[PDB]
């Protein structure tokens, strides 16, 4: 990745060895959760497509996922080229000719080139942009891993409000929503979805307290509330 | 972070990928312990919001306890506009302008801009108020969490001194009260919660003994209270 | 190996001990896997033939392998020196004297004269090629692991779409034939070892169906066809 | 070892303590086995002699056996004042004379003027030599591979062809003979040593077959070879 | 300790954790011994003698041996300071006054002390005095660790060649006694404590010969000799 | 070797085939040195290792007469 600031001008160095290896371990164990989107953005310091590339051409077992992606990733690339300004082709000579649509990933730009046009030329962000196709991607792969849709999620008559919550919530990763309607189901759905035991409670606790202040009150109760036997 | 000033201007360095992993596994094996509240300042050198809102998403099953603590910095910064000092709305020419209640959050702000008042216009600080406000979420999330109360922690027939007194100190971690009014509960709190026959050397010594005078008398004795070493 | 730029002149430098580490244990855990492919190309820093050469020397379990790739390496070497524009007679004093195949290999070079024509004068590609002709070394070695033929990916009456994309997927890795007739035949190939039931759903997709499109179609679906039973 | 060219004159580094532990978990590992000799070929970078006897004087339990290692280094140091040039004995002031083969070791030779010879006045070839002469050494421990022959590896009915080519590459490491040797008589001893079956198939390809022709063909050949029904 | 040149005089900079587990792993798992000589001398980086005594008092549970480690020590600093004691009292002012027998101890001596003679002055190596101490009561503590005395080395009638030659070279890492007599011991006494079987063997070999050729010889016979008898 | 056959009857076996070998002069030495004492029965298999390294075939024939039979019958008590 692109690294180096203090001691001058930025260069490109190798990934770390531990870095490769620490990143396939947490492939194996958290294959599609939704916790690997920030995860990615974190590990990946220095934007350089071709290590980006790199990571997702060394996926394991489990890689099919991974094309699909890479297929979503030429769609951008396509939008690029097309949807956004096109260009005539024939550049002015003492110009690089701009990269186009398919040479911002590494289809048909090398590590030279694109080192060329963020450092000897006013600064392209091609591994922001690459890294931003490569989450758009990543966020449709997220919602398709998610296994029961929320009109089909119902707290049990013997199942606690702890993972009632906690169901809830790691399947709301998976959305994709904006924040505002995220809230509005929010507010309804704990409600809605909720069992007899858990409702009896909840619906005195009613409208108007929010999530801390509700859980506060649910958790003080406990288990799947009345007559859980749990004293 | 922003980091460096011995080495000339300070530059937004990304966190360790080492830090990141022993943020997930003491997650993984101590989720929900009061030991992580310190634990979690320790580790944060230099709370920038974007980074410490990366720490918070990039969280495993709990995420519930995450977006409570989520709404915590939300109620937070709504209090932190609303009723902490206001800042005037039409800013002077060539000024960066104060940040709002949202913009202290990263989830309502962006990185480069935030660099600039935490950096250019003398010092906002805007990384200790929003470390504080996750302190506070962290201090709500062990109330939650815990199953037994001061009070119900009790020493068995058969239980060590050693086996109570750790226990009391271990609940005693999440009491969240005045340091003057704990100490004037906690000497009768010792003594009402000790198991009858074990409870007889801490009467024995009487008023004015501390825990290292008891626990000093304790190493005679020894177990649950036992008849001494020599009769 | 030979690496630095902007802070001086090009510096041979040592491979790290975690490098030979991790070779052995990726062997250990998975010997014959296509993923180990371009991990091998990610670990390369200077591709200079005598400590590449030291990471097929240091493999253990599958040598015969490894022996192989060497024999492939000899008739690559062989086929530069003589099938590839040949080497000239006596050249004059104060030259690099031309590589022939076996002084692009580590066998018949020294160290020191090797990056001498590498990198005292005008960079050659010396390292480049011998890294090429281990991929084509190694894609061999994966191909003669994998027991199923693409005709023998089948899907049983309780197998899964998502198990059956994986077994494709999987068997995709181990191809090592055109892409362009690759992907052109992806199109049918999928539909024709699909079971009447799996085949009727898949049927109404219809002709040129995108790998998102497709994915989108068998997530929907999940199981053995649509609507399943005792699983 | 002594590294700096470009930011100063070489200055001498203390090897880091992970290449130690790196050759005892080797030698823990697969005492003997002869993945060990390019190890620690590999981790012996700069090549100064106190540095390289450490990795000797460190081994363990097999210490004894290092003693004859130790040994032949003292018989390829005789062969120094012997086989090599003599020299002579009277040098006069003003140099740092070539060294005589009790010299090159660290028992005859102060760090400060071994370090000396290598780069106060035209560097001596002495981490080379002595390098070489433990490379020796370690190639003579072969012989301590007990019960270990060519003549005794006959594939089993039931054993399969890749356990039979695992067995054959085990012992072929520990052959000690010339390479022109080693083909002459490899072409007899692959088709001698198969079980029946598996033998009938190779008899079927007969004469002409190159070693990745005979592995290649063998692959949809299966287990040890064909099985018939028990009617 | 002290570190490095390069950036200018050498810094006092405490020693990595894992370095600090190094030094605790090696001890813990391979106790007093003679291998753990040599691998003191590579965990000791830096000739500070407030470092080096710290080493010895941050060891695990087997710390008699270490007791008597600081014991011996103590005694050979007295020795010190009576050998040398000329410059003993009064000095002309700016002279530093010197480190006597007992502050080549960093009990004795105080941090800022010590970095002052070692830096500023021509280089006294207190921290290197300090550590030959430390190797000489290893030397001592190895041949209390010996399980077995030279004159009770003998092989027993299951017992093979292998165990017995690596018992004798074993014991002559704790000796002691210069090279020669570990030379002139092993001239006569291999044959006369030998099995029947293996003694035979080494009897009819005969005067003269080296190590590698007894060994070679012994290899062929295997284990603990063929039963019956050969003229 | 078999149990019961002695040298003489073994190594003209091993001549006898050694005559259509059909490779070159240094390899045939290489095996040469090396296929008695591979392919002798073990009690005839004993003066071969006893005589040991840079042994000559006018050395070994000169053991191999002296030992005679096939191979004498060795003592344990």
């Not at 692109?2 to 620490?22: D, E, F």
């Not at 590990?43 to 060394?58: C, F, I, K, R, V």
């Not at 956004?84 to 990269?99: D, L, S």
């Not at 990543?138 to 049990?156: A, E, F, H």
Request: proline share 8%; with cysteine; charged share 20%.
């Amino acid at each position: 990745p692109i690294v180096q600031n203090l001691q001058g001008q930025m260069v490109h160095q190798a990934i770390s060895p531990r870095t490769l290896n620490a990143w396939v371990k947490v492939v194996e164990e958290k294959a599609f959760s939704p916790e690997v989107i920030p995860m990615f953005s974190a590990l990946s310091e220095g934007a350089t497509p071709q290590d980006l590339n790199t990571m997702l051409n060394t996926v394991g077992g489990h890689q099919a996922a991974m094309q699909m992606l890479k297929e979503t990733i030429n769609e951008e690339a396509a939008e690029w080229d097309r949807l956004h300004p096109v260009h005539a082709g024939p550049i002015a000579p003492g110009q690089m000719r701009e990269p186009r649509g398919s040479d911002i990933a590494g289809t048909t730009s090398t590590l030279q080139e694109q080192i060329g046009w963020m450092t000897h030329n006013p600064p392209i962000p091609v591994g922001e942009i690459y890294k931003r196709w490569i989450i758009l991607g990543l966020n449709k792969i997220v919602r398709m891993y998610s296994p029961t849709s929320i009109l089909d999620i119902r707290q049990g008559p013997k199942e606690p409000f702890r993972d009632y919550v906690d169901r809830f919530y790691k399947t709301l990763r998976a959305e994709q929503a904006s924040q505002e309607v995220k809230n509005w189901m929010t507010e309804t759905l704990l409600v809605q979805n909720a069992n007899p035991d858990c409702k009896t409670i909840l619906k005195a606790l009613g409208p108007g307290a929010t999530l801390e202040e509700m859980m506060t009150a649910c958790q003080g109760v406990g288990g799947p509330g009345h007559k859980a036997r749990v004293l």
